[PDB]
């Protein structure tokens, strides 16, 4: 009866599902298994960059604590 | 000057002859009106931008409107030789000759 | 038109010079223009007839491609000099585009193209407004200018203006036309006094828009736009023939007239800075614009052309117009030159 | 006729947006703000006809500073001399201009 | 003044709710006491760095560390 | 069918005055994360600050060091020379700190920002 | 790995439309009394297969009197400007995650009348030529509140930022503030992706096929695949303004699943409308985005103006 | 030559205008003119105008569909000129295309040129700021100081405007 | 950067769906069925033909309206500032202002479509 239409809407549902689990998982690859660094701003841009300067392995994602100093 | 205000300018002239020499079709050169209000938004927001004189920035926006609020009055205007004759061709605007 | 919309539309053209006058940044000097512009194309099509329509459509193109050249002009000014002041120019491409500009505002030759065409399309009142209230916003910014205008751009520009205004007025028989080149080589005095006092341009544009005022405001008050109108004026109302009179041989640069009063001072001017030649062409080249003036006086004062029979019944009927200041603005057009000293009011 | 209507009344009706050295929104600096403050300061009262000679060397400064020509010429000078002296061979550049350097923070 | 209200309401309503909208939003913050606030916190957020000022000797109202009793604070935010 | 009209005006002005409400906490509650975060931004300055002065001076004498080693056949040459006549300090130039490196470095130091995602 | 990350974007929605086909015919077959394709595949779950292989293997019939650079450009800017609107979508991490992600849904949706429009003049045809200028009268109309409903929704943002605005809405959905701007801005989506009552340039009863009555299959694909990227992308678009779910950072997943049902509701309610209402005259629907909308939406733009202002509520612009 | 990006959008921002100024029709002026307001908000948005930039795009979107259906409705012809129907606009349209890519052949071999201006030759990415505007993008304080800083240019903008509808309607009246 | 990978990518896959719909199917090309569509009868005269603007006064306004989406769009970031009467009495003087032309355009029958 009516409830034919789910198959279509559940499989169009699963395609609208995997953008978005996509691009978090992209996200998580591409950065150490954290979110995606947001630079809307020219300081959060500088952070990025700097960070990107004192990881030593030109990647703004791998994060340098207290054990780099002595 | 920097390398980029060469082809903007060049724009503006290039836009200035396409309006200063008719094609005979009053639309085509109300469209080069609205190419030079392009070219002189895109140069002065160019200065703008470069130098950080960050006030001037809303500037080119008023700039812009202004753009339409002439380019409004143009169609306004080609509406109404379009309605005299039945076609916006400049050369039926020659009755003031004598 | 609305008379309300009439109200709000012409204070909306005042308010435009008045921007132009008043303030100190070039954006504002062409927003003024822009509004002027934008506000006086429906006092050019108040009748709605084809020709209107054409007046304006030249009109909108020559003062939209002025306004191009004029905002070219202030951002080189922005590049050059990092700043918006309505000052001297700090770019002389900057100097010659808003120079070029303000010469196609003012219908300056050889940018003279649309000043008869445009004036002939319009009515008598809104060429009253175009010959004199749009003379006013690019003489400001041609006042605040002149420490960086070129000498030799503006001074061909004034004495192409003169030539041919003088030469464009003898060929006509349409008073509209008469009149604009006739503004045509009045601003070419205007401008070429322009580097050396710009006192006396202001004083020739003060007593030129007295005059042209008077003329437009006779020709208002005897309904007459062609040559052959104005000469029934005698058989209707012979006192306007009179101050026809009067104001043209006082436009033609006659003394003891008022019109005399900047010529002079202009030649007064240019004698100081050793200019000698240039006066002296200018003097020579404005018997053109007295001669068609002098054709004017008798094809309407001092000869009688012959009238029609229904002239009879306009005897009947008395001028119920609004003539407005006509009295007054006759006899400043006149009656001035003793009075010529007063022009240091305007340093 | 420039009939000073702002001055006279004492409002301020464009002189904000007038020069660069101006009050700016959240105290934003113009990359040309000091050499505009030294020039419109060196030219201040003395009228067009001696600032345009007595204070030529800070206006010079400060479109030097606007449109940066001197600078950009010399740039062309330096990066076409080392590409002159890359072609022949004559000129390593050095490994902090590569790359491998271990940048500073 | 109600009859020709009922008979804007029945004939036009979207402009009826259109000027009552626009008339709330005209007459409304000019009789509210939360204006002032939006004020103060737009005065308190701190996008430039607070430059400081040169100790000549005299200034009893300007702290010397952030911590410190003196200086503007924002318990009026915190609180509200 | 249905509710009358004032039944649903009630009910669309009282998720109105919900709305505005809730949206009010929670802005308020923005603006003083806002405030924390600029705060936060703030004590961070100085050492940005200083160390962004030690990098462009860096650069600008890596840039000057190798300035001498490239101009040294060209003739009235003159090394570091201002094109600037005051001796006051210029903040510099893009191509006057990335104009001698590679074209990785320069667009990430120059367009990077702007393209960033 | 940045092209993956395309790949996983426009490959799904170009399979979402294509079940999208089928859920409309469906859903519109179970509303008018019948039942749908239930024939291709197990309950139809193949016609949309069977549809895209027909429509490219058909002759495309390019006319004799069409200006053929426009005529083959106005597809392709078509697809493309329906895929490239699906980039500043924050799901909850946008594809491009853009400062002014709105205002880049804004122009590209007044970039993408220009394939409908182009369409409709270059096939050079009487019937596309009535549905290219309605176009025109549809744009006109629409664009004019689609700015300022949306614009007096991000007062209560601070930016124009799409991510920001589940950060906004992370207490209530802006629908319970912003309500008439909800109800006027679903209507003002309708009138923007051409669907029904607003259809008005694809309109059957009066203009055969409209402004793309020329075009035969293959080019007709990419004008019937792209408005219905149009109508997930604005469903989307709608829920990310109105309907803003739970986002835990380190549950992405479940803020998906959330938003994804939200706005498969939104489009089965096009499809609702589309299945039962009668379509305006497109000057019937100028009458309505100028005399109606437009004046309450300058209304709600001085209240979500003078609002935040009133009780202290201006969000913050970071 | 990823350096010069600013300067190719720049080339195509003049081949855009080269396309509508030289009138083949305005239906091509229209999408000429769109193209170059296009690549436009791509040269001014790599300056950090993202605001200032969408909206010029934006803008004149709407813009081109008014001009179109103007042109579709007042300056249509039956053989509408595509760019090459005209001798006189392909001869000007290859003239214009010829000399832009003739001054850029001249200031990519000699690094500078001179036509009125002097223009370098080197990537425009040289003048660019290396500082940071911290939790704010500048351009948008300066548009978003229209309503503090602006206020007579408000008046006059917004009275500019409204007379301008005034105006528009008094001229599409006939009588 | 990568902005313009995205629209090569979505610039490429729409024009390779394209490519592959012309060159893919058996192409029988003869002068009658790339003909115009007028319901089956040949068309009469040219769709190049002036086909006149009814809503052409509405499209005008439409010009001056859209600018007005380039001065309200401002008010996010104009709500954030430290002068806040003023930016509010020049926010309501602007929408006043269109709501000014609206209502004249309205009142003089502006919106109204011709014939
Ligand atoms: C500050 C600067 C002021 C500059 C002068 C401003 C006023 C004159 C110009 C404006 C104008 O068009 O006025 C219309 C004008 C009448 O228009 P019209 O067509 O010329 O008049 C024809 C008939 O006279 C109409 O007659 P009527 O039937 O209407 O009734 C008589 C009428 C009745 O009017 C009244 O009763 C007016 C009552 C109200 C007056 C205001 C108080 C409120 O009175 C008059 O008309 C008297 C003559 C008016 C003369 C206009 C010119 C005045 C001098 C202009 C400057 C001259 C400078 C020379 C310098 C030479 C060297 C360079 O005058 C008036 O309506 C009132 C004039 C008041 C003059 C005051 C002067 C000092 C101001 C301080
Ligand atoms: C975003 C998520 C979803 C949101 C909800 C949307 C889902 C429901 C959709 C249903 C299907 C619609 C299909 C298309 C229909 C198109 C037709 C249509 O809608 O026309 C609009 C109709 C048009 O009606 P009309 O055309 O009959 O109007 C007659 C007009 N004259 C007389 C000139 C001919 O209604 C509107 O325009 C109203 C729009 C919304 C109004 C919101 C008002 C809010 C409250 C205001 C204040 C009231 C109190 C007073 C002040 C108090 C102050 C304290
Ligand atoms: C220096 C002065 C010349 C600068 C431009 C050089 C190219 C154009 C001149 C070639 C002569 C032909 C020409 O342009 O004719 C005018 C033409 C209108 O003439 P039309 O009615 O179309 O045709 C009948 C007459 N041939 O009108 C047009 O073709 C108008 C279009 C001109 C577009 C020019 C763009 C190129 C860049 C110019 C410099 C910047
Ligand atoms: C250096 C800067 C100096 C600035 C000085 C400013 C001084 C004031 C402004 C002067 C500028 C020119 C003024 C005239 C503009 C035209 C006015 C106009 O056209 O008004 C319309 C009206 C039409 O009359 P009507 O018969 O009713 O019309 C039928 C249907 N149209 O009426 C008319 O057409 C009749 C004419 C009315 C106005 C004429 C009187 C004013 C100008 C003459 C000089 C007055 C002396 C004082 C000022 C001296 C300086 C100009
Ligand atoms: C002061 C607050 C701010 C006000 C300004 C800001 C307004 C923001 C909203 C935008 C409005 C833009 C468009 C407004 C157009 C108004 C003119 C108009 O349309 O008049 C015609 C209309 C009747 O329509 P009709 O003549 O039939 O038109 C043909 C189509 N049927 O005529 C009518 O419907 C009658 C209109 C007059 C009576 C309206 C009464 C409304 C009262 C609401 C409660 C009080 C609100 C406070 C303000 C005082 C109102 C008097
Ligand atoms: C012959 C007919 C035409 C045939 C070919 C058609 C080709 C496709 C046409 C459709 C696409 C048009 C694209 C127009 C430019 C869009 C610009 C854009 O997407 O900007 C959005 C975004 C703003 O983000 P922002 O606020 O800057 O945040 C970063 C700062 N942290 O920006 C960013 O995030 C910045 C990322 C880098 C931006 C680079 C500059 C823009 C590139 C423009 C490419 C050319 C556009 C050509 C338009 C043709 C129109 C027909």
């Given at each position: 009866?009516?409830?034919?239409?789910?198959?279509?809407?559940?499989?169009?549902?699963?395609?609208?599902?995997?953008?978005?689990?996509?691009?978090?998982?992209?996200?998580?690859?591409?950065?150490?298994?954290?979110?995606?660094?947001?630079?809307?701003?020219?300081?959060?841009?500088?952070?990025?960059?700097?960070?990107?300067?004192?990881?030593?392995?030109?990647?703004?994602?791998?994060?340098?604590?207290?054990?780099?100093?002595? | 000057?920097?390398?980029?205000?060469?082809?903007?300018?060049?724009?503006?002239?290039?836009?200035?002859?396409?309006?200063?020499?008719?094609?005979?079709?009053?639309?085509?050169?109300?469209?080069?009106?609205?190419?030079?209000?392009?070219?002189?938004?895109?140069?002065?927001?160019?200065?703008?931008?470069?130098?950080?004189?960050?006030?001037?920035?809303?500037?080119?926006?008023?700039?812009?409107?202004?753009?339409?609020?002439?380019?409004?009055?143009?169609?306004?205007?080609?509406?109404?030789?379009?309605?005299?004759?039945?076609?916006?061709?400049?050369?039926?605007?020659?009755?003031?000759?004598? | 038109?609305?008379?309300?919309?009439?109200?709000?539309?012409?204070?909306?053209?005042?308010?435009?010079?008045?921007?132009?006058?008043?303030?100190?940044?070039?954006?504002?000097?062409?927003?003024?223009?822009?509004?002027?512009?934008?506000?006086?194309?429906?006092?050019?099509?108040?009748?709605?007839?084809?020709?209107?329509?054409?007046?304006?459509?030249?009109?909108?193109?020559?003062?939209?491609?002025?306004?191009?050249?004029?905002?070219?002009?202030?951002?080189?000014?922005?590049?050059?000099?990092?700043?918006?002041?309505?000052?001297?120019?700090?770019?002389?491409?900057?100097?010659?585009?808003?120079?070029?500009?303000?010469?196609?505002?003012?219908?300056?030759?050889?940018?003279?193209?649309?000043?008869?065409?445009?004036?002939?399309?319009?009515?008598?009142?809104?060429?009253?407004?175009?010959?004199?209230?749009?003379?006013?916003?690019?003489?400001?910014?041609?006042?605040?200018?002149?420490?960086?205008?070129?000498?030799?751009?503006?001074?061909?520009?004034?004495?192409?203006?003169?030539?041919?205004?003088?030469?464009?007025?003898?060929?006509?028989?349409?008073?509209?036309?008469?009149?604009?080149?006739?503004?045509?080589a009045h601003?070419?005095w205007?401008?070429?006094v322009?580097?050396?006092?710009?006192?006396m341009?202001?004083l020739n544009?003060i007593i030129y828009?007295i005059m042209?005022?008077?003329?437009?405001?006779?020709?208002?008050?005897?309904?007459?736009?062609?040559?052959?109108?104005?000469?029934?004026?005698?058989?209707?109302?012979?006192?306007?023939?009179?101050?026809?009179?009067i104001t043209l041989l006082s436009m033609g640069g006659l003394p003891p007239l008022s019109g005399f009063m900047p010529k002079w001072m202009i030649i007064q001017e240019?004698?100081?800075?050793?200019?000698?030649?240039?006066p002296?062409?200018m003097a020579i080249?404005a018997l053109?614009n007295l001669?068609?003036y002098m054709?004017?006086?008798?094809?309407?004062?001092?000869?009688?052309?012959?009238?029609?029979?229904?002239?009879?019944?306009?005897?009947?009927?008395?001028?119920?117009?609004?003539?407005?200041?006509?009295?007054?603005?006759?006899?400043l057009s006149t009656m001035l030159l003793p009075l010529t000293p007063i022009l240091?009011?305007?340093? | 006729?420039?009939?000073?209507?702002?001055?006279?009344?004492?409002?301020?009706?464009?002189?904000?947006?007038?020069?660069?050295?101006?009050?700016?929104?959240?105290?934003?600096?113009?990359?040309?703000?000091?050499?505009?403050?030294?020039?419109?300061?060196?030219?201040?009262?003395?009228?067009?006809?001696?600032?345009?000679?007595?204070?030529?060397?800070?206006?010079?400064?400060?479109?030097?500073?606007?449109?940066?020509?001197?600078?950009?010429?010399?740039?062309?000078?330096?990066?076409?001399?080392?590409?002159?002296?890359?072609?022949?061979?004559?000129?390593?550049?050095?490994?902090?201009?590569?790359?491998?350097?271990?940048?500073?923070? | 003044?109600?009859?020709?209200?009922?008979?804007?309401?029945?004939?036009?309503?979207?402009?009826?709710?259109?000027?009552?909208?626009?008339?709330?939003?005209?007459?409304?913050?000019?009789?509210?006491?939360?204006?002032?606030?939006?004020?103060?916190?737009?005065?308190?957020?701190?996008?430039?760095?607070?430059?400081?000022?040169?100790?000549?000797?005299?200034?009893?109202?300007?702290?010397?560390?952030?911590?410190?009793?003196?200086?503007?604070?924002?318990?009026?935010?915190?609180?509200? | 069918?249905?509710?009358?009209?004032?039944?649903?005006?009630?009910?669309?002005?009282?998720?109105?005055?919900?709305?505005?409400?809730?949206?009010?906490?929670?802005?308020?509650?923005?603006?003083?994360?806002?405030?924390?975060?600029?705060?936060?931004?703030?004590?961070?300055?100085?050492?940005?600050?200083?160390?962004?002065?030690?990098?462009?001076?860096?650069?600008?004498?890596?840039?000057?060091?190798?300035?001498?080693?490239?101009?040294?056949?060209?003739?009235?040459?003159?090394?570091?020379?201002?094109?600037?006549?005051?001796?006051?300090?210029?903040?510099?130039?893009?191509?006057?700190?990335?104009?001698?490196?590679?074209?990785?470095?320069?667009?990430?130091?120059?367009?990077?920002?702007?393209?960033?995602? | 790995?940045?092209?993956?990350?395309?790949?996983?974007?426009?490959?799904?929605?170009?399979?979402?439309?294509?079940?999208?086909?089928?859920?409309?015919?469906?859903?519109?077959?179970?509303?008018?009394?019948?039942?749908?394709?239930?024939?291709?595949?197990?309950?139809?779950?193949?016609?949309?297969?069977?549809?895209?292989?027909?429509?490219?293997?058909?002759?495309?019939?390019?006319?004799?009197?069409?200006?053929?650079?426009?005529?083959?450009?106005?597809?392709?800017?078509?697809?493309?400007?329906?895929?490239?609107?699906?980039?500043?979508?924050?799901?909850?991490?946008?594809?491009?995650?853009?400062?002014?992600?709105?205002?880049?849904?804004?122009?590209?949706?007044?970039?993408?009348?220009?394939?409908?429009?182009?369409?409709?003049?270059?096939?050079?045809?009487?019937?596309?030529?009535?549905?290219?200028?309605?176009?025109?009268?549809?744009?006109?109309?629409?664009?004019?509140?689609?700015?300022?409903?949306?614009?007096?929704?991000?007062?209560?943002?601070?930016?124009?930022?799409?991510?920001?605005?589940?950060?906004?809405?992370?207490?209530?959905?802006?629908?319970?503030?912003?309500?008439?701007?909800?109800?006027?801005?679903?209507?003002?989506?309708?009138?923007?992706?051409?669907?029904?009552?607003?259809?008005?340039?694809?309109?059957?009863?009066?203009?055969?096929?409209?402004?793309?009555?020329?075009?035969?299959?293959?080019?007709?694909?990419?004008?019937?695949?792209?408005?219905?990227?149009?109508?997930?992308?604005?469903?989307?678009?709608?829920?990310?303004?109105?309907?803003?779910?739970?986002?835990?950072?380190?549950?992405?997943?479940?803020?998906?699943?959330?938003?994804?049902?939200?706005?498969?509701?939104?489009?089965?309610?096009?499809?609702?409308?589309?299945?039962?209402?009668?379509?305006?005259?497109?000057?019937?629907?100028?009458?309505?985005?100028?005399?109606?909308?437009?004046?309450?939406?300058?209304?709600?733009?001085?209240?979500?103006?003078?609002?935040?202002?009133?009780?202290?509520?201006?969000?913050?612009?970071? | 030559?990823?350096?010069?990006?600013?300067?190719?959008?720049?080339?195509?921002?003049?081949?855009?205008?080269?396309?509508?100024?030289?009138?083949?029709?305005?239906?091509?002026?229209?999408?000429?003119?769109?193209?170059?307001?296009?690549?436009?908000?791509?040269?001014?948005?790599?300056?950090?105008?993202?605001?200032?930039?969408?909206?010029?795009?934006?803008?004149?979107?709407?813009?081109?569909?008014?001009?179109?259906?103007?042109?579709?409705?007042?300056?249509?012809?039956?053989?509408?000129?595509?760019?090459?129907?005209?001798?006189?606009?392909?001869?000007?349209?290859?003239?214009?295309?010829?000399?832009?890519?003739?001054?850029?052949?001249?200031?990519?071999?000699?690094?500078?040129?001179?036509?009125?201006?002097?223009?370098?030759?080197?990537?425009?990415?040289?003048?660019?700021?290396?500082?940071?505007?911290?939790?704010?993008?500048?351009?948008?304080?300066?548009?978003?100081?229209?309503?503090?800083?602006?206020?007579?240019?408000?008046?006059?903008?917004?009275?500019?405007?409204?007379?301008?509808?005034?105006?528009?309607?008094?001229?599409?009246?006939?009588? | 950067?990568?902005?313009?990978?995205?629209?090569?990518?979505?610039?490429?896959?729409?024009?390779?769906?394209?490519?592959?719909?012309?060159?893919?199917?058996?192409?029988?090309?003869?002068?009658?069925?790339?003909?115009?569509?007028?319901?089956?009868?040949?068309?009469?005269?040219?769709?190049?033909?002036?086909?006149?603007?009814?809503?052409?006064?509405?499209?005008?306004?439409?010009?001056?309206?859209?600018?007005?989406?380039?001065?309200?769009?401002?008010?996010?970031?104009?709500?954030?500032?430290?002068?806040?009467?003023?930016?509010?009495?020049?926010?309501?003087?602007?929408?006043?202002?269109?709501?000014?032309?609206?209502?004249?355009?309205?009142?003089?029958?502006?919106?109204?479509?011709?014939?």
């Amino acid at each position: 009866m009516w409830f034919e239409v789910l198959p279509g809407i559940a499989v169009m549902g699963v395609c609208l599902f995997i953008p978005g689990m996509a691009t978090a998982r992209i996200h998580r690859f591409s950065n150490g298994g954290r979110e995606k660094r947001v630079a809307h701003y020219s300081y959060q841009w500088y952070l990025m960059e700097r960070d990107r300067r004192v990881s030593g392995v030109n990647r703004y994602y791998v994060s340098k604590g207290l054990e780099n100093i002595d | 000057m920097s390398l980029v205000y060469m082809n903007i300018m060049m724009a503006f002239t290039v836009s200035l002859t396409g309006l200063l020499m008719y094609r005979s079709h009053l639309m085509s050169s109300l469209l080069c009106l609205e190419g030079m209000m392009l070219s002189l938004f895109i140069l002065a927001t160019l200065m703008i931008l470069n130098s950080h004189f960050t006030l001037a920035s809303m500037m080119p926006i008023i700039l812009l409107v202004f753009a339409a609020c002439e380019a409004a009055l143009g169609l306004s205007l080609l509406v109404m030789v379009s309605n005299t004759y039945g076609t916006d061709y400049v050369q039926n605007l020659n009755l003031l000759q004598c | 038109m609305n008379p309300i919309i009439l109200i709000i539309i012409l204070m909306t053209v005042m308010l435009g010079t008045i921007i132009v006058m008043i303030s100190t940044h070039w954006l504002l000097i062409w927003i003024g223009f822009e509004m002027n512009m934008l506000a006086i194309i429906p006092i050019m099509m108040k009748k709605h007839n084809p020709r209107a329509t054409e007046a304006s459509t030249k009109y909108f193109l020559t003062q939209s491609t002025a306004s191009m050249l004029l905002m070219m002009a202030i951002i080189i000014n922005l590049m050059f000099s990092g700043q918006w002041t309505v000052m001297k120019l700090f770019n002389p491409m900057a100097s010659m585009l808003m120079t070029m500009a303000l010469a196609m505002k003012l219908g300056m030759a050889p940018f003279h193209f649309w000043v008869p065409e445009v004036t002939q399309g319009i009515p008598l009142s809104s060429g009253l407004i175009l010959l004199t209230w749009q003379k006013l916003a690019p003489m400001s910014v041609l006042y605040q200018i002149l420490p960086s205008i070129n000498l030799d751009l503006i001074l061909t520009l004034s004495i192409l203006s003169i030539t041919i205004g003088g030469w464009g007025g003898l060929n006509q028989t349409q008073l509209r036309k008469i009149m604009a080149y006739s503004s045509i080589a009045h601003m070419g005095w205007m401008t070429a006094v322009l580097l050396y006092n710009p006192t006396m341009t202001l004083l020739n544009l003060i007593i030129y828009i007295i005059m042209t005022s008077t003329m437009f405001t006779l020709f208002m008050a005897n309904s007459t736009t062609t040559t052959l109108s104005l000469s029934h004026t005698w058989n209707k109302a012979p006192i306007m023939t009179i101050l026809v009179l009067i104001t043209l041989l006082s436009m033609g640069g006659l003394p003891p007239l008022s019109g005399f009063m900047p010529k002079w001072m202009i030649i007064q001017e240019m004698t100081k800075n050793d200019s000698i030649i240039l006066p002296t062409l200018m003097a020579i080249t404005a018997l053109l614009n007295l001669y068609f003036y002098m054709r004017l006086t008798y094809s309407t004062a001092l000869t009688m052309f012959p009238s029609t029979n229904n002239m009879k019944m306009k005897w009947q009927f008395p001028t119920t117009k609004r003539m407005t200041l006509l009295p007054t603005m006759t006899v400043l057009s006149t009656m001035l030159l003793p009075l010529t000293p007063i022009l240091s009011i305007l340093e | 006729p420039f009939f000073d209507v702002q001055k006279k009344l004492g409002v301020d009706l464009d002189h904000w947006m007038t020069i660069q050295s101006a009050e700016q929104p959240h105290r934003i600096p113009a990359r040309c703000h000091a050499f505009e403050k030294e020039w419109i300061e060196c030219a201040h009262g003395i009228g067009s006809i001696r600032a345009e000679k007595e204070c030529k060397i800070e206006f010079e400064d400060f479109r030097e500073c606007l449109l940066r020509q001197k600078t950009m010429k010399r740039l062309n000078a330096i990066k076409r001399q080392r590409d002159k002296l890359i072609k022949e061979g004559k000129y390593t550049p050095p490994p902090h201009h590569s790359g491998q350097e271990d940048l500073r923070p | 003044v109600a009859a020709f209200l009922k008979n804007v309401w029945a004939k036009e309503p979207v402009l009826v709710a259109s000027f009552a909208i626009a008339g709330l939003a005209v007459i409304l913050p000019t009789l509210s006491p939360y204006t002032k606030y939006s004020l103060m916190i737009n005065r308190a957020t701190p996008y430039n760095y607070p430059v400081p000022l040169r100790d000549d000797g005299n200034m009893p109202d300007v702290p010397s560390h952030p911590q410190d009793p003196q200086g503007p604070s924002l318990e009026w935010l915190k609180r509200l | 069918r249905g509710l009358s009209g004032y039944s649903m005006f009630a009910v669309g002005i009282g998720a109105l005055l919900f709305g505005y409400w809730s949206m009010m906490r929670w802005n308020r509650e923005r603006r003083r994360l806002q405030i924390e975060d600029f705060e936060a931004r703030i004590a961070l300055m100085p050492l940005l600050q200083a160390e962004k002065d030690r990098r462009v001076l860096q650069m600008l004498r890596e840039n000057l060091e190798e300035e001498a080693t490239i101009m040294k056949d060209v003739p009235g040459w003159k090394v570091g020379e201002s094109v600037f006549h005051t001796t006051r300090w210029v903040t510099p130039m893009m191509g006057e700190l990335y104009g001698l490196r590679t074209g990785e470095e320069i667009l990430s130091s120059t367009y990077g920002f702007i393209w960033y995602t | 790995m940045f092209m993956i990350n395309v790949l996983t974007l426009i490959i799904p929605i170009l399979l979402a439309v294509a079940f999208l086909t089928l859920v409309e015919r469906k859903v519109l077959g179970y509303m008018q009394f019948r039942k749908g394709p239930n024939v291709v595949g197990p309950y139809g779950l193949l016609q949309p297969i069977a549809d895209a292989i027909k429509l490219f293997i058909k002759e495309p019939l390019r006319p004799a009197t069409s200006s053929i650079s426009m005529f083959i450009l106005a597809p392709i800017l078509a697809l493309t400007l329906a895929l490239t609107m699906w980039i500043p979508l924050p799901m909850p991490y946008p594809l491009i995650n853009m400062n002014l992600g709105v205002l880049f849904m804004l122009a590209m949706s007044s970039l993408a009348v220009y394939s409908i429009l182009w369409s409709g003049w270059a096939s050079n045809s009487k019937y596309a030529l009535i549905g290219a200028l309605r176009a025109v009268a549809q744009t006109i109309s629409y664009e004019v509140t689609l700015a300022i409903i949306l614009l007096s929704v991000l007062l209560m943002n601070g930016s124009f930022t799409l991510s920001t605005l589940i950060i906004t809405q992370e207490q209530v959905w802006l629908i319970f503030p912003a309500w008439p701007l909800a109800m006027m801005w679903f209507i003002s989506t309708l009138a923007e992706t051409n669907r029904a009552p607003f259809d008005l340039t694809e309109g059957e009863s009066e203009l055969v096929s409209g402004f793309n009555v020329e075009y035969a299959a293959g080019p007709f694909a990419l004008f019937f695949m792209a408005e219905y990227a149009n109508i997930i992308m604005m469903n989307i678009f709608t829920t990310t303004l109105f309907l803003g779910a739970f986002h835990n950072p380190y549950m992405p997943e479940l803020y998906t699943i959330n938003f994804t049902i939200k706005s498969l509701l939104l489009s089965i309610t096009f499809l609702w409308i589309r299945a039962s209402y009668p379509r305006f005259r497109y000057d019937q629907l100028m009458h309505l985005l100028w005399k109606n909308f437009l004046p309450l939406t300058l209304a709600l733009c001085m209240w979500h103006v003078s609002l935040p202002i009133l009780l202290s509520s201006i969000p913050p612009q970071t | 030559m990823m350096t010069y990006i600013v300067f190719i959008l720049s080339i195509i921002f003049v081949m855009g205008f080269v396309g509508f100024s030289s009138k083949p029709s305005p239906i091509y002026g229209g999408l000429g003119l769109i193209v170059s307001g296009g690549v436009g908000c791509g040269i001014v948005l790599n300056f950090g105008g993202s605001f200032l930039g969408l909206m010029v795009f934006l803008i004149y979107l709407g813009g081109m569909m008014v001009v179109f259906g103007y042109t579709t409705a007042m300056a249509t012809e039956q053989y509408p000129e595509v760019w090459v129907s005209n001798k006189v606009v392909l001869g000007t349209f290859i003239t214009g295309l010829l000399m832009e890519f003739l001054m850029v052949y001249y200031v990519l071999k000699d690094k500078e040129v001179e036509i009125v201006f002097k223009f370098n030759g080197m990537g425009d990415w040289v003048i660019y700021d290396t500082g940071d505007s911290g939790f704010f993008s500048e351009e948008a304080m300066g548009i978003a100081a229209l309503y503090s800083y602006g206020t007579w240019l408000v008046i006059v903008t917004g009275w500019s405007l409204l007379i301008g509808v005034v105006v528009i309607m008094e001229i599409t009246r006939g009588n | 950067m990568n902005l313009m990978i995205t629209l090569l990518t979505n610039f490429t896959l729409a024009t390779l769906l394209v490519t592959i719909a012309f060159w893919l199917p058996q192409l029988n090309v003869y002068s009658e069925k790339t003909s115009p569509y007028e319901c089956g009868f040949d068309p009469m005269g040219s769709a190049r033909l002036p086909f006149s603007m009814k809503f052409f006064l509405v499209a005008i306004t439409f010009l001056l309206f859209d600018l007005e989406i380039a001065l309200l769009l401002p008010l996010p970031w104009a709500s954030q500032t430290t002068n806040l009467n003023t930016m509010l009495t020049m926010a309501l003087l602007l929408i006043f202002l269109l709501a000014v032309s609206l209502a004249y355009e309205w009142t003089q029958k502006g919106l109204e479509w011709t014939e």
